[PDB]
C-alpha cells in the first residue's frame, strides 16, 4: 500500500513553503501531514524505514545543510525532528536510498556546485563523504540500480548537462555512461523495470515535456512518450509499477497536477489536479 509524499518547494505565494501532502493513488485522496519546521524550496526528500527525510534546500536566505525527519507512524499527529546535518549545504541536490542509507549528491551551496556525494546512516545519525563526481552538478537526480548509483544531467553553473555519471561501489569512483539525447536540469528521475526514466526539465532555452529512458542492460537511451505538459523542477517517483511526474513549473505556471506513465498503455494520464501548486519540491514513497 504505497502513497506519494510531496514536501516543501516553491509555492504560488512566490516563496518557499512548508506544506507536506500525501496522495493515495488508489483512492485518489489527498491529505495534509504535519508541515516541516523550516520552509524549503530546491529541496530533496527520501523515505527510509518508515521515516520521511527532508534534506537541504533553500529557505529564501541560505542554502541548507540541515535535515528534518518525520516518523511515519500509524497514530498520526507526528512531529518533525532535526537530525544530523549534511557535510555541505545543498540546494537542488539529488537523493536516493540504498539499503539502510541515504545518498545525496551534487547541489549548490550558494557559491559552488558540488562534485561531492555523501551518505547517511540513521542508526549512527551521521553523514560521511564519498567520491567526488567528475562534473559538479545541480538539478541532477540520483537513482540506484543494481547497487550502482547514477547522477544524471543537471547544471554545472555554466552549461546544462546531458552527461550521466555512475558510481561503482567496487572502486568508489564515478565514471561516465552514455549521455542523454537532451540536456536537462530539474528533470524528474526514477527507476522502472530496469530503465531510468528522465522526465521534463529545462534544456537552457525551453521547459521540456519530453521523456527519455536509459536501458541499463544496454547502456543506451530511447525516446518515451512525451508528458501532457512541460514540467521543470518536477519530482518523479514509481509506485505499483507506474511512473508519476509530480507538479512542477511549466515555464509559465506552477502546476498542481500529477500525471502517470503507465507502460501498459505507453502514455501519460493526468490522474489528479488537486495538489498544492509548487515546484522543486521533494517527493518520496511511503507504505501504509
Amino acid at each position: 500500500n504505497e502513497v506519494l509524499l510531496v514536501v516543501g518547494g516553491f509555492g504560488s505565494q512566490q516563496s518557499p513553503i512548508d506544506v507536506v501532502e500525501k496522495y493515495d493513488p488508489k483512492t485518489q485522496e489527498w491529505s495534509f501531514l504535519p508541515s516541516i519546521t523550516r520552509k524549503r524550496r530546491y529541496v530533496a526528500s527520501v523515505s527510509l524505514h518508515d521515516r520521511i527525510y527532508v534534506i537541504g534546500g533553500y529557505d529564501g536566505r541560505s542554502r541548507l545543510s540541515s535535515v528534518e525527519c518525520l516518523d511515519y507512524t500509524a497514530d498520526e499527529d507526528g512531529v518533525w525532528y532535526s537530525v544530523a546535518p549534511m557535510n555541505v549545504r545543498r540546494g537542488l541536490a539529488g537523493a536516493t536510498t540504498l539499503g539502510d542509507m541515504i545518498y545525496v549528491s551534487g547541489g549548490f551551496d550558494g557559491s559552488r556546485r558540488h562534485t561531492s556525494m555523501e551518505r547517511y546512516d540513521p542508526n549512527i545519525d551521521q553523514w560521511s563523504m564519498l567520491g567526488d563526481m567528475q562534473t559538479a552538478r545541480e538539478g541532477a537526480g540520483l537513482v540506484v540500480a543494481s547497487g550502482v548509483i547514477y547522477c544524471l544531467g543537471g547544471y554545472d553553473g555554466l552549461n546544462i548537462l546531458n552527461s550521466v555519471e555512475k558510481y561503482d561501489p567496487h572502486t568508489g569512483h564515478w565514471t561516465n555512461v552514455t549521455p542523454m539525447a537532451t540536456k536537462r536540469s530539474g528533470a524528474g528521475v526514477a527507476l522502472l523495470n530496469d530503465h531510468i526514466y528522465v522526465v521534463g526539465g529545462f534544456d537552457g532555452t525551453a521547459h521540456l515535456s519530453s521523456v527519455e529512458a536509459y536501458n541499463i542492460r544496454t547502456d543506451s537511451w530511447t525516446t518515451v512518450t512525451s508528458m501532457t505538459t512541460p514540467r521543470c523542477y518536477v519530482g518523479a517517483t514509481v509506485l505499483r509499477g507506474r511512473l508519476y511526474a509530480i507538479a512542477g513549473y511549466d515555464g509559465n505556471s506552477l502546476l498542481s497536477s500529477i500525471e502517470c506513465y503507465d507502460p501498459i498503455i505507453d502514455s501519460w494520464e493526468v490522474v489528479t489536479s488537486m495538489g498544492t501548486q509548487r515546484c522543486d519540491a521533494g517527493v518520496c514513497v511511503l507504505r501504509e
Partner: peptide, 8 residues
Amino acid sequence: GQAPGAPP
C-alpha cells in the same frame, strides 16, 4: 530563484 528555468 536564479536557477536555470525556475520561476522568477
